[PDB]
């Protein structure tokens, strides 16, 4: 339950084979955000009630390539990080780089939320 077993890994490769149908190995620009919308089962995450982690994962998916493509060896390692408790099961260089990335990406999503709120004030006033 703390780590992804073979049933959850099998569910991830079924949903990867079902979302990538054109058989070359990549996910294109148009369909990177539509990948985690239908993950259910033992990794049940919905559109509501988990919005902060939703926007956090949504910003983690579009930071390492500056948009565009994500490959078959990046996203599963990041979910493998996110699906386990990282406080006592991680080492010092990786934990320190992980908490620095977590702090700077939390600061960046705070900037993004206050920026879209400023946009919302622009459209509300005018």
């Amino acid at each position: 339950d703390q780590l992804l077993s073979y049933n959850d890994l099998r569910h991830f490769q079924i949903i990867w084979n079902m979302v990538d149908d054109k058989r070359e190995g990549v996910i294109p620009t148009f369909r990177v955000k539509f990948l985690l919308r239908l993950l259910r089962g033992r990794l049940e995450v919905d559109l509501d009630k988990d919005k902060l982690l939703f926007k956090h994962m949504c910003y983690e998916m579009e930071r390492l390539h500056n948009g565009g493509d994500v490959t078959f060896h990046d996203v599963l390692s990041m979910l493998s990080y996110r699906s386990v408790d990282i406080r006592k099961s991680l080492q010092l260089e990786e934990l320190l780089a992980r908490e620095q990335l977590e702090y700077t990406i939390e600061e960046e999503v705070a900037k993004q939320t206050i920026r879209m709120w400023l946009k919302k004030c622009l459209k509300r006033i005018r």
Binding site: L92, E93, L96, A97, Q100
Partner: peptide
Amino acid sequence: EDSEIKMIQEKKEQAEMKRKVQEEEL
């Protein structure tokens, strides 16, 4: 944040110096 990599860099750096002084003192 980045006070870890500099330690291993200066470790291999002082390894290169002790290799150099070992090759030239004898």
